[PDB]
Amino acid sequence: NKITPNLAEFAFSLYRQLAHQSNSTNIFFSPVSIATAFAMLSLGTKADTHDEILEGLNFNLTEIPEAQIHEGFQELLRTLNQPDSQLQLTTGNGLFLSEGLKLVDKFLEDVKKLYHSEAFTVNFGDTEEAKKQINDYVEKGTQGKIVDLVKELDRDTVFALVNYIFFKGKWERPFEVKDTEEEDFHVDQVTTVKVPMMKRLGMFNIQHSKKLSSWVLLMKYLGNATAIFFLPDEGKLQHLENELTHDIITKFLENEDRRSASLHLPKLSITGTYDLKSVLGQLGITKVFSNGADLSGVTEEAPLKLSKAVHKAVLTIDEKGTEAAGAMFLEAIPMSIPPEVKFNKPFVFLMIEQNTKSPLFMGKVVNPTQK
């Protein structure tokens, strides 16, 4: 798990960029899927273009050898692409390159062999048909869940990257549908909206953190992942966002202890769509999107730059994540008043893959019914 600290810092860097940009919208993105796509792309770049990318993903190239970076990403992909995975995770990366380019076989081999990703040639001379081909690829890859991903292409496009991820997890310890009811969600300290709110009395991995001024809830999914939800104390959302660190998350993931609580958690259907040229440009990744780009690992003779790069992430949170019957279990609830922990005001969340501890997703809910 050598690259996990870097992925965590990338997650927080990207989150803080998006949060300072717009503080009134739900945020949801996958640090892992973005970082993996750009680590893969780096194999086609050289010199400053290459270094900017890996440094933009929070790798200090004076300290970590490149071989360990790629081995880390490949080991992570090994755990997510497992066959019998109960994690209902659908992800893909597509590279779309102008059909007139002479491509380097080494790069295409690395994309398919090392990063288990897809590369296609398209006629960008027909921008409308190219956009349709790109969007059909995403729609097929998500069985219809993400449609019309790319809304526009520049006329001079020669290279586009699309990165998509859809997740609908199944709780190990699920909620009962019969207990979901409409409850107030406090969008601010004087205003509420009604949202569907799941609830359950149970033994939870839950604690209050003085450091974060927040309640911290960990719930495991079937498969290899855990959701962490952070509910800030009154007026402490900004403090929570400022104080999150990888070491703090690691301590929470080592807790295991369980206490009784009456938990209220909203159903969620949220998406995030991001222009990675703009977002990653603010993190220092600019040359690969510019005319100066050194993409000679992709095509040796012709100029090339990455004209379009889009990330779309889709999340569903519900009671069970499946119509299938769940394994029966019993939690022993003590005869004492459980705290009532209601995720009924803006909150932050992170999903972690259990083996590598990597940040599969990060987000913020400001209003469940926004969307």
Side-chain angles (χ1 to χ4, degrees), residues 1 3-19 21 24-62 64-70 72-74 76-77 79-80 83 85-87 89-98 100-101 103-108 110-111 114-139 141-144 146-151 153 157-175 177-209 212-219 221-233 235-242 244-250 252-255 257-286 288-300 302-319 321-322 324-327 329-370:
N1 302 339
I3 68 169
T4 292
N6 310 88
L7 287 174
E9 288 307 299
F10 176 65
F12 301 151
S13 292
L14 190 43
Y15 178 92
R16 286 167 181 144
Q17 164 67 20
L18 299 168
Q21 174 188 133
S24 56
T25 304
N26 294 328
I27 296 170
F28 183 65
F29 66 96
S30 172
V32 164
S33 82
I34 293 164
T36 301
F38 274 79
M40 184 198 69
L41 176 69
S42 76
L43 293 174
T45 65
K46 306 211 177 74
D48 289 316
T49 304
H50 168 278
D51 298 352
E52 262 191 10
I53 292 166
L54 294 183
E55 295 278 344
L57 302 176
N58 295 75
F59 294 104
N60 184 343
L61 302 182
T62 74
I64 185 171
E66 290 183 27
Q68 293 191 5
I69 295 173
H70 295 290
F73 280 109
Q74 290 153 210
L76 182 50
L77 283 166
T79 71
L80 299 176
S85 174
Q86 293 175 97
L87 213 65
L89 191 62
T90 290
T91 194
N93 198 83
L95 295 186
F96 293 84
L97 288 151
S98 172
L101 299 169
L103 299 176
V104 174
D105 285 87
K106 177 59 179 180
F107 178 72
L108 300 179
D110 294 2
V111 166
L114 292 172
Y115 276 89
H116 305 291
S117 207
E118 306 173 73
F120 305 97
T121 57
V122 290
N123 175 20
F124 283 118
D126 190 336
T127 63
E128 287 298 303
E129 184 63 10
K131 183 172 105 69
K132 173 180 183 298
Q133 279 166 357
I134 292 168
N135 287 340
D136 289 355
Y137 156 80
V138 174
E139 192 175 333
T142 61
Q143 303 82 34
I146 299 163
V147 315
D148 294 333
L149 178 54
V150 173
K151 289 314 198 298
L153 285 175
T157 297
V158 287
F159 183 17
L161 178 155
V162 293
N163 184 265
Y164 65 87
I165 189 158
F166 171 93
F167 181 53
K168 184 169 111 164
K170 300 179 281 283
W171 299 118
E172 173 182 312
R173 317 273 179 112
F175 298 83
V177 172
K178 68 162 179 293
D179 293 315
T180 299
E181 303 182 81
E182 301 287 310
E183 289 188 26
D184 286 336
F185 188 95
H186 303 263
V187 294
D188 57 52
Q189 276 161 22
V190 304
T191 312
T192 54
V193 301
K194 297 294 189 177
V195 307
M197 188 76 68
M198 312 182 292
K199 59 180 176 294
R200 87 180 286 267
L201 173 62
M203 299 302 282
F204 290 99
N205 185 339
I206 195 167
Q207 63 188 279
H208 190 275
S209 171
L212 300 184
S213 304
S214 300
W215 280 100
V216 182
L217 168 70
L218 285 78
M219 299 198 300
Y221 288 109
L222 296 177
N224 49 313
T226 300
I228 312 178
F229 298 90
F230 305 91
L231 179 70
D233 294 351
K236 285 293 196 305
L237 171 61
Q238 264 283 8
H239 175 72
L240 162 64
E241 293 173 330
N242 289 345
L244 281 173
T245 66
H246 180 58
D247 292 334
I248 286 172
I249 298 310
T250 299
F252 292 141
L253 290 166
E254 300 170 348
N255 172 37
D257 287 1
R258 288 185 186 264
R259 73 174 77 156
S260 72
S262 187
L263 174 67
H264 298 236
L265 185 71
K267 296 184 81 185
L268 291 177
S269 303
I270 59 180
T271 65
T273 309
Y274 305 98
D275 173 357
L276 296 177
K277 176 177 178 188
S278 169
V279 173
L280 300 177
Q282 297 285 348
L283 297 180
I285 307 180
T286 66
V288 74
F289 301 106
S290 90
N291 288 330
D294 190 342
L295 281 155
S296 58
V298 180
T299 194
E300 292 183 356
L304 188 65
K305 69 178 185 183
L306 184 55
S307 310
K308 183 79 173 182
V310 180
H311 176 66
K312 174 139 198 208
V314 179
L315 173 66
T316 299
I317 292 180
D318 64 10
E319 292 93 340
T322 179
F329 66 96
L330 285 169
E331 291 168 357
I333 297 167
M335 183 191 65
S336 55
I337 283 286
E340 196 159 7
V341 181
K342 298 193 168 193
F343 283 80
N344 66 355
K345 54 181 174 165
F347 64 88
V348 178
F349 64 88
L350 183 68
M351 279 88 184
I352 302 294
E353 193 276 307
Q354 277 167 8
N355 296 314
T356 60
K357 307 292 186 294
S358 63
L360 292 162
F361 302 106
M362 187 167 186
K364 173 166 59 173
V365 176
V366 304
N367 178 349
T369 52
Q370 129 180 336

